[PDB]
Motif scaffolding. Structure first.
Motif, short mmCIF file in Angstrom:
data_model
loop_
_atom_site.label_atom_id
_atom_site.label_comp_id
_atom_site.label_asym_id
_atom_site.label_seq_id
_atom_site.Cartn_x
_atom_site.Cartn_y
_atom_site.Cartn_z
N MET A 70 0.79 -1.24 0.04
CA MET A 70 -0.11 -0.02 0.14
C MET A 70 0.95 1.21 -0.08
O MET A 70 1.83 1.24 0.79
N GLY A 71 0.40 2.09 -0.72
CA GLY A 71 1.47 3.44 -1.06
C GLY A 71 2.31 3.17 -2.29
O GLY A 71 2.73 4.38 -2.95
N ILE A 96 2.08 -1.41 4.79
CA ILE A 96 1.89 0.02 4.38
C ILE A 96 3.11 0.74 4.30
O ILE A 96 3.96 0.71 4.92
N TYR A 97 3.39 1.50 3.07
CA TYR A 97 4.61 2.38 2.75
C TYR A 97 4.22 3.60 2.71
O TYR A 97 3.51 4.33 1.99
N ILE A 98 4.57 4.40 3.97
CA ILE A 98 4.38 5.85 4.50
C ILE A 98 5.73 6.43 4.87
O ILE A 98 6.41 6.05 5.32
N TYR A 99 5.59 7.85 4.84
CA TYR A 99 6.76 8.56 5.13
C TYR A 99 6.54 9.35 6.27
O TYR A 99 7.22 9.72 7.28
N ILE A 100 5.31 9.99 6.50
CA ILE A 100 4.71 10.98 7.39
C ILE A 100 3.35 10.29 8.06
O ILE A 100 3.34 9.90 9.15
N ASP A 101 2.24 10.54 7.22
CA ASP A 101 0.93 10.11 7.68
C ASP A 101 0.28 9.12 7.12
O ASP A 101 0.61 8.93 5.90
N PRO A 103 -3.18 7.35 5.16
CA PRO A 103 -4.27 7.95 4.83
C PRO A 103 -5.45 8.13 5.46
O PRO A 103 -5.49 7.56 6.72
N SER B 29 -10.40 6.64 1.02
CA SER B 29 -9.20 6.97 0.78
C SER B 29 -8.87 5.79 -0.40
O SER B 29 -9.00 4.73 -0.42
N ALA B 31 -6.08 4.54 -1.87
CA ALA B 31 -4.83 3.62 -1.48
C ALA B 31 -5.55 2.34 -0.82
O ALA B 31 -5.18 1.25 -0.96
N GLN B 35 -6.32 -1.84 -1.82
CA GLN B 35 -5.40 -2.74 -1.29
C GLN B 35 -6.33 -3.65 -0.57
O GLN B 35 -6.26 -5.07 -0.20
N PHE B 104 3.75 10.18 -4.06
CA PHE B 104 5.24 9.95 -4.28
C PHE B 104 5.47 10.33 -5.96
O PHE B 104 6.62 10.79 -6.53
#
Ligand SMILES: CCCCCCCCCC(=O)N[C@H]1CCSC1=O
Ligand SMILES: CCCCCCCCCC(=O)N[C@H]1CCSC1=O
Ligand SMILES: [Co+2]
Ligand SMILES: [Co+2]
Ligand SMILES: [Fe+2]
Ligand SMILES: [Fe+2]
Lengths: 314, 314
Positions: A70-71, A96-101, A103, B29, B31, B35, B104
């Motif tokens: 995801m992401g 889940i692939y996130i850097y900050i927040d 969804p 959402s 994403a 998924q 991204f």
């Protein structure tokens, strides 16, 4: 038996063979593809994934592990199509692939709700299919371990405790995000040997890389070809030194190659500048020959690409 | 014909009739749904959407404008099916809904590259379809105006100057984000009267609200029913106060009602606790009768719900 495969009956870990632990068949942003489908071509994307996998097999790759989650635009039905057309062992994952927040969905949702999503993919199947997840993928980068990044980490731990699938990660080699991913997971009760801390090969700082290996986890020297992070020749020398110091136990090697990726940082016309030799078979053309002529025994190549992945899934 | 509609030929701004300027048929959402589709029931979503719109039409609503865009799970085909089942005038839009960072995909992509996507939706169509966008939707909240949030705003300005379509915004009433959105858009050359600054109804501060109105943009008293932001009665005293102070030429009213929403903060069970009377018809049941009792006549209601949306789309 305890490794699920995309479009195939499952196999035992001892049957994994030569493995590439980290390669993407395709990456895209779910939201932008859904809203603007005119930016994409599935015919090109399928042509690229099949071409790369077929060449990977030609060099003796038996199993590819793909952490598109995801992401990153995971699509199990695209993955079945690639399998049917090539015959490769493909391990799909959840996560889940996130850097900050997270969804917006996840606003006021517990870690257990997030873990239930992963356990679903592992036990029941992915995207209304019968193909199962073989691992959990998490991420952290420059922003560090944010509130939401951490929720996802602890949720991956619950999935592992409950299913015994291993965990692969994304980290920034220059933060300590990998050190922190490992710390949180082990504190939650995850076996260190069930964790692959990713993107350690983006740095020279061998003192930091050994610190993660000394604590029991595999080390991701996994972005071979991406010169913008670290050039191939500094990677080769970091890899060689770790082996010489006795760390082939924990070393895992890959390219993090994306046959197609929608990111603005990607494309041709940047490939000559940023990643000239980046493909799914570069370690066969460069890394493995390099190591062979620098005093590395064939036994070590077997440890990295066969014994380490087998252990990881055991 | 100026205004494009979902599943219908376009109309002149003068035939828009009674309008609800901000309502959602469905929000999810992107994403998460892609998924984990096991979390969603489409029949239930379609049923919730049809029933709400039918009640609104019975009460005299001719047109509904739906600001669901990227990040909120815009789906022109689901929108089409609802139009078929009711016969409503539905105005769809384009844009990006973020609070912090962009997907991204947008890593090192220009503001003009973003503007091109909005322009494609306005001029060519939405999601491989012949239905066109009639406005641009942008957002900012608690994190304030980030560098990605600013990029989307500046891109909305390009789409407006190129296509003449108006701009609807999401803001945090307590931040100054609405005033900043207006400032950036006007500095870029956007007619203040082509801008709706959203969610200003979430505050008591009449001085802050009037500030935006004095600069020439429509003010969003647009979350009637959501008592957790501000209760109905305190919204009523601000709306009445503004009309009395002479500001009906700039007032727009709606509920921001979501017939279904996957947000965890918005679980249908928190409804009696957080937003008990929230629906697509609250203003017909409470707000309008309240204003009428208090001396404001029918022509002032006609300005807010018929003449102001007309101006907005002219
Ligand atoms: C010409 C190629 C440009 C160099 C690629 C730069 C992009 C950063 C590396 C990268 O592609 N990271 C993404 C891709 C797979 S999943 C993930 O974490
Ligand atoms: C049902 C229980 C009340 C809580 C409402 C949920 C949160 C407020 C409504 C709401 O979430 N509005 C969101 C959705 C569309 S745009 C936007 O910013
Ligand atoms: Co990564
Ligand atoms: Co909003
Ligand atoms: Fe990757
Ligand atoms: Fe909204």
């Amino acid at each position: 038996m305890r490794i699920p495969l995309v479009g195939k009956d499952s196999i035992e870990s001892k049957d994994i063979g030569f493995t590439l632990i980290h390669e993407h068949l395709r990456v895209f942003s779910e939201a932008v593809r859904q809203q603007w489908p005119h930016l994409y071509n599935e015919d090109e994307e399928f042509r690229n994934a099949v071409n790369e996998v077929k060449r990977a097999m030609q060099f003796g790759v038996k199993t590819i592990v793909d952490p598109t989650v995801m992401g990153l635009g995971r699509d199990i039905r695209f993955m079945e199509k690639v399998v049917k057309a090539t015959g490769i062992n493909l391990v799909a994952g959840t996560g889940i692939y996130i850097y900050i927040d997270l969804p917006f969905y996840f606003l006021n949702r517990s870690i257990d709700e997030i873990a239930d999503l992963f356990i679903h993919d592992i036990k029941e199947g992915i995207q209304g299919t019968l193909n199962k997840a073989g691992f959990v993928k998490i991420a952290a980068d420059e922003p560090g371990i944010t509130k939401d990044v951490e929720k996802v980490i602890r949720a991956a731990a619950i999935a592992n405790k409950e299913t015994k699938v291993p965990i692969i990660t994304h980290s920034n080699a220059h933060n300590n995000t990998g050190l922190e991913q490992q710390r949180i997971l082990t504190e939650e009760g995850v076996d260190p040997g069930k964790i692959l801390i990713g993107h350690l090969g983006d740095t020279d700082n061998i003192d930091y890389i050994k610190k993660i290996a000394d604590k029991g986890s595999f080390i991701g020297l996994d972005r071979y070809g991406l010169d913008l992070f670290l050039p191939v020749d500094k990677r080769n020398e970091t890899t060689l030194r770790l082996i010489k110091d006795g760390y082939s136990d924990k070393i895992m090697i890959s390219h993090d190659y994306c046959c197609t990726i929608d990111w603005g940082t990607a494309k041709p016309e940047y490939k000559p500048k940023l990643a000239p030799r980046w493909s799914i078979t570069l370690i066969f053309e460069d890394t493995i020959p390099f190591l062979k002529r620098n005093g590395v025994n064939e036994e070590v190549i077997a440890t990295i690409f066969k014994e380490n992945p087998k252990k990881f899934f055991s």
